[PDB]
Amino acid sequence: MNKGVMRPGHVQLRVLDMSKALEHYVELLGLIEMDRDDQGRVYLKAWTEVDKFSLVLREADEPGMDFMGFKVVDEDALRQLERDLMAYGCAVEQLPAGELNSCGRRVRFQAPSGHHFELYADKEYTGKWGLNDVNPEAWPRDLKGMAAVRFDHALMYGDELPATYDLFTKVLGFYLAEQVLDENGTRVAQFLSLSTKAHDVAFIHHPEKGRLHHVSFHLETWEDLLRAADLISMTDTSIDIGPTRHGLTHGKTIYFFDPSGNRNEVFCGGDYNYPDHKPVTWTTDQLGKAIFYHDRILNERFMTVLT
Template sequence: MAMTGVLRPGHGAIRVLDLEEAVHHYRDILGMVETGRDAQGRVYLKCWDERDHNSVVLRQADRAGLDFFGFKVRDKATLDKMEADLKAYGLKTERIPAGEMLATGERVRFELPSGHLIELYAEKKAVGNGLQVTNPAPWTKASENGIAPVRLDHCLLYGPNIAEVQKIFTEVLGFYLVERVLAPDNETNAAIWMSCSHKVHDIAFVEHPEPGKLHHLSFLLDSWEEVLRASDIMSMNGVPIDIGPTRHGITRGCTIYAFDPSGNRFETFMGGYQPYPDYEPTTWTFDGLGAGGGLDYPQRKLHETFLTVVT
């Protein structure tokens, strides 16, 4: 499919309780590459196979959670048009100047009805993945450090008014609905998975009374064997595991959910099918989330912590 408009998830900025402890987790255990620190004390990291300067930004704070989540758009003209479209829809936008984040151009920020801050940007310094552009090798030494995911894949956010959130993403930003879980009334959506590409999802939301909550950031691995290896590395390093290794019915993804030292959940993920915008969305009933295997297909059960623990 033609890649226009929003290209992909670009960065997640998360709050941590102890910065150096978090850096150790994301750099040495998860296996990301530290790419810089700024005057505000924020630490920037990228996955080894990502070309852009950063995809995770860590900031020390007195409570964990998500500051904002950003998407990269095709070019500056696209950024200008999308800001105009957001304003026409009735959303207030803020222009954040280039350089406020390291190696990142001008950003357009807006708040969703769910209480989350979303950003769009067109420019970020390309630092490459450590491989030559011509006749490259398939991996680098950085890909052997820790779990070593290849990219930031998606995020799941909890908050209210996800019906309106869905409209903003589909009618303004050009996403499409891939899967949904119905609420017990079998009419409204309790959860939605949306894509701007032909990935099974680039962002997801669950209806939740508290605004602005982070459920998880997800990092892509290449194979089920790498997911199993990730579980070994987590166990060796005392990383608290929430669920997995297992397989979702929803998205068909293979997964482990675990917590960073501040209590922010993260996912190591692989698989999922490749949808297209003309596909009919897959619907799960609320009962299907548990007994139907939507969350945990092998065990066909719900996990209380997965449904209730957010930051």
């Protein structure tokens, strides 16, 4: 929030089968569908979210992430981060309003790590789902599946971490919240925050660019996580790593896959920070614990399986 960037606003994932993806995202995750495209894309949101959509699905031949967008305070900030990116040397793409139904104009650049990110000031305000603006209840009564609270963050596997770190900190205004260093003091992973969250975006080093480790969704409680895991067994969804706690951020989490092999994370309550806190450090000799607090060892497929 240092340069006007407030939060992750939307992510567009690629799926092999739309119908399968919708069963998963609307029936299991609890995501509410909102729009459809000229191009056949499907727009979805979470209920505590005020804007039109946060998740957009696109039928494609390979799964993965097309791009992640962050919403900025206003247009003044949009032009100022747009010019700074071009001034920094980043070749920017100007996306026109409407190219994504109900979304303002976007600035799409490519991170040195190979991922495409977007910045945007506008998006259609539909308000919280199933709730009134005046004298609102605690929650809408007919939410489904897990009833994801909101699109929280996403973790990426990437190639140039130093250059990506400079881009996000210097030109975009993210601050380092968590990090994992090796014996030399080299950042193997970096958790960047935009406000008080342990992280709004994160990168872990990888030989091949553009990899997506997972897209997360926020859940409220530890008993919500148990409910979610019961739902996984119930629907026979594939689970990566059950209810546990992360060494980094100390948040409770469950990893599972969608019909396309994309990994989804659902998690609740981690640690908070503020721009003035020193980054929490984890070391490479504690990589097991840093990822999996309770087992202190690494899931083979945690590092191998990407999309």
